[model samples]
Target: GPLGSGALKWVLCNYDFQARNSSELSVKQRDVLEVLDDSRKWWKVRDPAGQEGYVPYNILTPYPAAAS
Candidate 1:
């Protein structure tokens, strides 16, 4: 798994995403989001502003851990 024990996973938004449903999060390019779960096609994440919602997996990528 990409996540380590007791580590909170993080991801980056590589492209802008407009949510078609309220269940999703509308994110912009270059935004950093916290990964709640990555086990599905749509990921559960908490945005920088602390909003929680799902985002299509295709638009997100693992944020480099060393960058923090």
Candidate 2:
């Protein structure tokens, strides 16, 4: 990860509890979801657990700022 803003590619900060893939991200609460594609309504992301799918735009959030 980089310094300052870190390695996050986008600034999404809305997390809808009922997002289509909220279940997959539930286990990765403290992990960063690598932003894959933001062109669509649902951003394609992948968790460190190897799970990947589309999450609601309102469900993406700015990951906590921490050093890696």
Candidate 3:
């Protein structure tokens, strides 16, 4: 499927993902996070890793649908 942009992006925090777009967030990867408020430059997420904060909304890709 196409990449998820404006919806609930339930992704596994991949420590080994290599994004061609950029690598800022990849360096400082968090183990857990959530979704809710998306703004001009960031999204307010429920960070289970601690220190709930707004991260770049573009940082997350939706979880792949086919575990089959």
Candidate 4:
């Protein structure tokens, strides 16, 4: 599936507190294509072209993953 502009899949919060959009925490951008496991707090995300990495689940928005 191709992700369109403004398509947000997941979020990562601070390792301490589970807060959404916390100013004290850092937010990472997640690639929807590489999301392997959604049950875990950390997800495997890839770059637009398939570069992969793990990301936490606090800084993410559009809960339950957004689609375009």
Go through the candidates in order and give each one's C-alpha lDDT: 0.82, 0.58, 0.50, 0.45
Q: How are the candidates ranked when ordered by lDDT, highest leading?
A: 1, 2, 3, 4
lDDT of 3 by residue, 1-68 (tens): 88866865654444543333432233134455665666565555554545445455555555676665
* Residue 15 lDDT in candidate 4: 37
> Which lDDT tens digits does candidate 2 get at residues 9-40?
64334434434434444423344567888897
Error of 2 at 18 (Å): 6.3
Q: What ranges in model 2 sit over 4 Å off?
A: 1-31, 64-68
lDDT of 1 by residue, 21-55 (tens): 86887988878888888798988999767679988
Ranking by TM-score: 1, 2, 3, 4
The TM-score that candidate 1 achieves is 0.76
TM-score to true structure, per model: 0.76, 0.50, 0.43, 0.38
**Candidate 4 on 14-49: residue-level lDDT in tens?**
233322343222223432343445788765544455
Worst 10 residues of 4 by lDDT: 22-31
Model 4 TM-score on a 0 to 1 scale: 0.38
